[PDB]
Amino acid sequence: ADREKLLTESGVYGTFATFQMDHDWWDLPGESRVISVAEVKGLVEQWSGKILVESYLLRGLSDHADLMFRVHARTLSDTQQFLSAFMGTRLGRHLTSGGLLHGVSKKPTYVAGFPESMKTELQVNGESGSRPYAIVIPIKKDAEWYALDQEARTALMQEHTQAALPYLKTVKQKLYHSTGLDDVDFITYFETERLEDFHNLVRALQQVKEFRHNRRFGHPTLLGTMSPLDEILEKFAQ
Amino acid sequence: ADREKLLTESGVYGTFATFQMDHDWWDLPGESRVISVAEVKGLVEQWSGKILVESYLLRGLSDHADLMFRVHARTLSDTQQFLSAFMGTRLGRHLTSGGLLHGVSKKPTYVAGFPESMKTELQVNGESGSRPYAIVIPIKKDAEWYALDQEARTALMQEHTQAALPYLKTVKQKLYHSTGLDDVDFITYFETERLEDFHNLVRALQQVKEFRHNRRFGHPTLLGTMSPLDEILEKFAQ
Amino acid sequence: REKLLTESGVYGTFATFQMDHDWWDLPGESRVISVAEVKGLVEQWSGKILVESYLLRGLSDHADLMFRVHARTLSDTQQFLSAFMGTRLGRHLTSGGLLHGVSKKPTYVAGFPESMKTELQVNGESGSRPYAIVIPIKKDAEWYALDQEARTALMQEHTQAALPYLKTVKQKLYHSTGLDDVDFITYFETERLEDFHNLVRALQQVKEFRHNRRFGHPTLLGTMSPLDEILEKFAQ
Amino acid sequence: REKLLTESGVYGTFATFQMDHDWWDLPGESRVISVAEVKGLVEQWSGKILVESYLLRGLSDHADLMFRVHARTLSDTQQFLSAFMGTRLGRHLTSGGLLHGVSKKPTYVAGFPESMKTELQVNGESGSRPYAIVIPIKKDAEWYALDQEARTALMQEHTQAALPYLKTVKQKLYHSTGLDDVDFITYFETERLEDFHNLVRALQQVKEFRHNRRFGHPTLLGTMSPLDEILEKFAQ
Amino acid sequence: DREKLLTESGVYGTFATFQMDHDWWDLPGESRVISVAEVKGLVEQWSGKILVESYLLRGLSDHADLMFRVHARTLSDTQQFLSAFMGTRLGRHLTSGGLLHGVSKKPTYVAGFPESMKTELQVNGESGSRPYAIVIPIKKDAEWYALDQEARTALMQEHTQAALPYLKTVKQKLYHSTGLDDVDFITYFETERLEDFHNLVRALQQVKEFRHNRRFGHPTLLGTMSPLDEILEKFAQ
């Protein structure tokens, strides 16, 4: 019910955690693993009041990673507890952590200075689909970007928004402000049924003048499929 | 029969996976190894209906690698399943991944604006030989490249193509558009019986003005021999 | 404790550790005895150094524990850290970070206008169990070429944009050149991260930010809880 | 053999290996049997390739042994190297870098003065068990942008600075572009490392050096000796 | 003699760092104490051709426990010693963590300095017991080597000028390392007061030479100087 209270509202932290599965996990008998999966489900369900957790299968799409959590929380302290709890699970004890990025979502900064025609197009909701592809791209702006005045950056971001608009219907997007919580300024999240559209989306943004201000683009670029936690861990049950 | 329908048609994703074999693999008794090899062979044959898998021996040609998969599929979802099954396999659980790159094939962008004399020579298929050397080079363009207009880049790529033409008869080439699926913009793939030609090919392309725009060239530069999957896995028995 | 967190000439070390998998393969009572060994080690050193504990687990990747050790002589800090890694607990820890930084009298403060000076004597965030952020910084070559005046001016614009955060963000600077691969170690306590997030974005606008060659890497983030509260979470 | 160390069209492969900890857990007798397997494999391949060995243990970090393998085709080098790492000894070896480079007939020497051409025909240093250095090199985009005359002139300046070291430093160059991540592989033999050192700083003065985008990384240093004596030293 | 390696030129200097495995603590204490005794002798057995000094980097430098500063007239001898050491039972529980060689030479630019500066330079420095020790590798940019002998000489005089007030509290040593590894220089320092050593470096960050340092540190090795036995004693129980 309060699902969207975290996915859209501001002041909401957003955390990306990646995990890789150890070798010993398959030494466990199939029965012992199926049980282990249930412990996680409950931990998530027990935490379903304070946070929100969505899972993605990165195995075979992203290098050196199997599982990613997108955890929403009113405070990062709560996410700290959950991740510690998750890694304390018998399943989690057979997981080696592989990267962690936090980012708080905020109300738009440059959109207000856009054309009223452009503002409208942005209210085109996007792509709402079941089990879509998911992409995560961290970004760091160069010192030059921050030196610019508010009007200049606003105009640059209008050029940014303009090139992306014809992909709004097929590519969902969300932005996390990450500066000061790690080594990145932004975390970008995307959902798509057609990866070819998302690709064309990116080269289209390679055309704008904004791209040259990106000191860091990707590294790592997390690609994966979106699916309920049960089916992912089920694939780990064999 | 259904084979060439993927290697030439557009919309076909192409995935490159590299693996290295652990030390613990040789601690395993031979009997355990022969079964592990057998588990892999059938699984590949089991997946021969939805995708295409070719194997390459990087052992002794590429550092920290023994095996490379060139997997073609209309959807990355299928490739994700295959790779996940493969790395869960008893052989695969003794494999460490060493890079993973996706790239969708596309309809040529600059060829249409070429001289008709150049277009024709490009339609020359190339040299078809058995068990050739294979090189894979990922490439990332600098921010300047994407800033240029359609005419400048086109002229640059004609200068590119021009230097490459005398190698068409001895070097097969194919290009995958990779931006947004990982940390690279392109994936280049080559087959040749003559490595000395491939070398001369590259320095010839080092002279052109396009080359200076490659922020990343190689890293890693994958070299290997092309051969059936059985023969590679055969070497891990004994 | 005030002698070490305030005075100059007091070194500050930042040790980061991550726990092994096979630590959880150890029987539950062994972890208890292990934890009990560490407290006695810190206690025997309390008369020479000051050890503060942090919990990076679930906030800072490839990290579980962080120490902030203060000592007027770095030798004392060396004996301790080798001993901690010698302890049964420490033999199951892969250290992944170690930064030293001495404290010194302010360089560019006296040059500042005294309106700003008085605002720097203003208390600051006095919180309990707050978030903690450690950022290492390396200046470029151009920075050190600039004369004192040109640099003192740049730190004025620096101190300026930071003033609205002084009450919600605690700060401490460690001079770290020639002890590791960074020039400065910045340490911050705060109950509000969005506040601290603002402080950085605000500081990104000054021209002094241009002269930061290495910014972050790694950017450590965790909660500042007492030692026992972190070690009790380990035995389970 | 000498038809391979000098003729053009000859591929040259550099393989580095590090010895595991588990190898020394093995009793001495178990190793000697393993050593014997390698000797035969080399002799079995002595028809299609040529193999020279180097002791990097204690001179280059994270390395004990290096192979310099000459062959007209890399496939043969591939078979040998794949077989070698399958050897009982090779199953206790972790691979540590691999660089190929085909030898070709000189490009710029022809445009040199005959006074310089002659001095280059001075064979070099022939010594027993000399030091050996291997340096991979990548040229910047600017170098390849130059037309044929400047590079020719630049390499004449290169050759000029190197001449007083010909009698004490043997050298050979491999064209490596397209087979890995480097453009060239340089190989040197010298009884006097101090000579080789003075040689390198002498070449740091020329205008060519600035066009070297990548210089070394890794820089392989080692001693040259028969394969038997190296492997024997890995015994007991 | 004893002194022929710490001052003379043509003497190679090698820096080897090692980290201690986890399996080392699986061994019973006495078995380790014996291993310590084995190492002591190997050093003394080699005490004729080379010189070995040891440093504790455990808890001061990341990912390192022990460092050797080995001086030898030939690198071949140092190669043998390290191979024996890493083959030693203690050494089989050691993982190597970086290796840099550098030959000491007679000064290149000092001759062109004022004798007022030369005199102050003849002050050897501070000889103290168990001082801190710092190792900083350095690589100069291509621009530096493009400069003529006079400019570089003047730049190095500016370097020397800034360092002088630290001569009495900071010992300095320079190794010419180009061609033996991936660095051009290796710098070694001893001081009882690290606070002095810090001020020394930012003072040297002001000069125009510093911008020519393509690589400065990476890694920057810090540690304590002490006899090999007392260091190894800590690796026993």
Ligand code: HEM
């Ligand atoms: C349909 C796709 C997209 C749309 C509609 C879009 C639109 C926008 C808009 C309106 C903003 C302003 C938000 C604000 O006021 O702070 C923004 C910010 C941003 N976007 Fe996107 N964008 C899209 C795709 C992308 C992609 C593909 C990337 C990176 C791979 C990206 C990275 C960023 C970053 C880093 C910012 C913050 C810029 C800054 O404030 O410095 N966006 N985008």
Ligand code: HEM
């Ligand atoms: C050997 C024969 C080769 C031929 C016939 C050839 C031809 C071409 C042609 C016609 C294009 C235009 C693509 C389009 O129109 O959309 C192209 C693109 C490209 N080629 Fe090649 N090429 C060859 C070798 C190579 C090599 C050796 C490399 C790199 C080592 C390379 C790297 C690339 C890259 C990165 C592009 C992407 C163009 C872009 O950035 O937009 N090619 N090639």
Ligand code: HEM
């Ligand atoms: C409430 C927040 C902050 C306050 C009140 C503050 C204030 C100051 C002041 C007054 C100085 C001058 C030191 C002196 O005179 O010796 C200084 C130095 C410095 N600060 Fe901050 N600052 C704040 C936040 C930050 C942050 C967030 C960072 C980095 C992410 C930072 C990095 C530095 C650095 C690198 C220096 C020394 C630069 C140099 O000497 O070259 N500060 N700060």
Ligand code: HEM
């Ligand atoms: C006694 C010492 C040396 C001699 C006699 C020597 C001589 C030569 C000559 C004559 C050439 C040009 C041959 C041709 O392509 O026609 C050459 C090429 C080259 N040398 Fe050396 N050289 C010496 C030292 C070095 C060293 C120390 C290095 C690097 C560490 C080096 C790196 C190279 C490279 C990268 C090229 C080819 C560059 C290009 O073709 O773009 N050389 N050498």
Ligand code: HEM
């Ligand atoms: C502490 C007292 C120091 C003194 C008295 C001193 C003095 C000198 C002198 C006289 C030379 C000339 C060498 C020659 O003639 O060949 C020299 C070279 C050099 N020193 Fe120092 N120095 C000191 C500290 C340092 C420090 C702290 C560093 C680096 C962190 C350093 C790095 C270097 C380098 C890289 C060179 C060789 C530069 C080149 O030839 O390109 N020195 N030093």
